[PDB]
Symmetry: D3
Subunit: 150 residues, 6 copies
């Protein structure tokens, strides 16, 4: 279905390195539709909730601290297979192992400063979207370029 | 002063044509700092207030209708001379007269679909920013690349 | 051999989305030489002949209708291993599975609107070229940048 | 009117330097619609006719020889004010005097190798189009991105 | 004459902001030939000599300190009218007044951090080149793309 | 460790095709720091030493001749995993087999004209760096964008 949505957040390092527009442009070119978008400095509570899955791990603390360390550009994209597609456009966890052509492959060097976050599944996408955005902040009627879908 | 701010809004045509990231990237490259950012479908009241200066003109109606016709990406940039600089990066009113190298020169053809709005003065910038953004939505502490300012 | 040729056609969706120049530029950068090029709205006969291999399949009808639905930019590129190379630059059938860095990976989302066609073999390349182009429309003397071939 | 057309020809030097896609992409981004397109090696007769206005000047010979010296990509673009707009995107006669942001400003250095030709007026555009293209080679129904024109 | 040369130095701020390749690529695209190139951290003596013309001004001290504050990428480009052309590609002294399409127009905001230096005349170019480069470090035989000069 | 270094040399074909800035920009974007950089026409001795590992093979002669055939831009980049990362950004030996997104995948077609050389291991990187650069030519203090490393 073409109404699939994913949550992406350009982390503080990406924002600080001026990659926000470059990242958004890549998704717009692909044909995904921007359904939600806003810059914010995440509070500890939102952060801990975002990374709840790692709450029992030791690096959980470092994740929370970093993401709340500066502005973040949170966005929600809609489109067919956007969740897996966006992961693919992002690259693998280690930027050094990510292929040129992907966001982390092109701009990153360190796991801890890997620029962007993308939901890893439709269900995590749904949880993250509802976590980071009020429903009023999301487009209800999405109209993509007609030359994109059969 | 380097804390000058301007208000930019990628109008519905720019959003629909997938130029949001391309426009943001241009300002980030320049060295201006993203201080506010969000996508929204403007209500009639916000629109009429935004274009209040033309409220006595006949084309006022067309301005209001268009901007409320679809999503808009509103943003606030900070930096030295950002208000005049951003206007310069945008181009002149008529995209056909705008030089290559500017947003309207590169992507537009019609006055009525000229892609983006930029405050025309510091005072209009201050009015528009306060109009489109709650104070909570704007970064308070802005830190630019240290290689930008002497 | 460096005189190998392949047939590429930017389908109606690619033309309509303004990707013609972006696609041609990618091949020119690679070092392949443009040997034939023209825009046309394919007739049903040319279309059915182009997709003859699927004439017994049900989706054959949809293929024919789409390609004749609007202008198409047909082109022939020459160079060593251009047939496989061009396929690689294009991506896989499903744009969602195509890697960033490839045409379909960067710009497409749907199999049915996958932007471009590239011959799948030297023999199909030879058949397609002879199908879409009169011999008078193809360069006879091709001279590539001397820094490309040993 | 939005049905205005102009004739552009990427001269032999532009084709040889691999700038065809880069030039087409610039016009597509602007929002102009590709209405005719083909590569050809101009004959002396077409060349002399193209440059007829200089037939009494001494450099006329050099113009004719160069343009017939290799392949040329001829194209016709449609859009509002496309004739003046395209000239503006091209730059001035001397590439060294052309501003960055324009084709000649970005890629050329010599008047004699100034990359591209653009009609200088609507009437010359009409003469050149009819000179370089058969009517069958031009789109009759042009549909631009709806977000381009008011 | 096509053997004209100019001296360009990407100052410490440009190097630090990762603009070295972007700046070199702009000149290579234009058709100018790289004749000398090296990264170095300028000593005080070279700096004072470089800016000797301002030695009687008060800002002379600030010029010397900045340029010796970090690595610099010095380069010499050759081509017809390269000295004026390169200045034009650079922009005006104040990056805020420089037009999009130029280096300072696209990437700078402050006079003191204006990214790059370009000789202002053929004679200053000759003095700077001889100042920053040993003759052994400059190409003697320069061969440009044959499609550049008539 | 983040102080790892690799040696890259844009071979004569890459320099001649104007890809120097494009290649440097890719590494700068990735976050690697330029530690050494200079253009030179390699002597036979440096060449034979560079390719010593193939000195017993027949193609050794062709390697030496080509690299000494014109200017070369030698550079040293520093960063975590830069040696493997840079190889990955370069592509595989055969440009035709290299994926879009990599230097050879995007710009090359022939093994013999594969544009750039990158050390294949840390030890070969150390040997090549010491071979091509005097210690005085390498930055001692390297400071990367702070948003790159955790």
């Amino acid at each position: 279905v073409n109404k699939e949505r994913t949550f992406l957040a350009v982390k503080p390092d990406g924002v600080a390195r001026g990659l926000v527009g470059e990242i958004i442009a890549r998704y717009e070119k692909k044909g995904f539709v921007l359904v939600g978008l806003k810059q914010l400095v995440p509070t500890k509570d939102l952060a801990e909730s975002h990374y709840a899955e790692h709450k029992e791990r030791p690096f959980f603390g470092g994740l929370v601290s970093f993401i709340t360390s500066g502005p973040v550009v949170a966005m929600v994209f809609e489109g067919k297979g956007v969740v897996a597609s966006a992961r693919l456009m992002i690259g693998v966890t280690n930027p050094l192992a990510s292929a040129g052509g992907s966001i982390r492959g092109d701009f990153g060097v360190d796991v801890g400063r890997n620029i962007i976050h993308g939901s890893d599944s439709v269900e995590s996408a749904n949880r993250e979207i509802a976590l980071w955005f009020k429903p009023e902040e999301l487009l209800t009627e999405v109209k993509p370029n007609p030359n994109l879908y059969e």
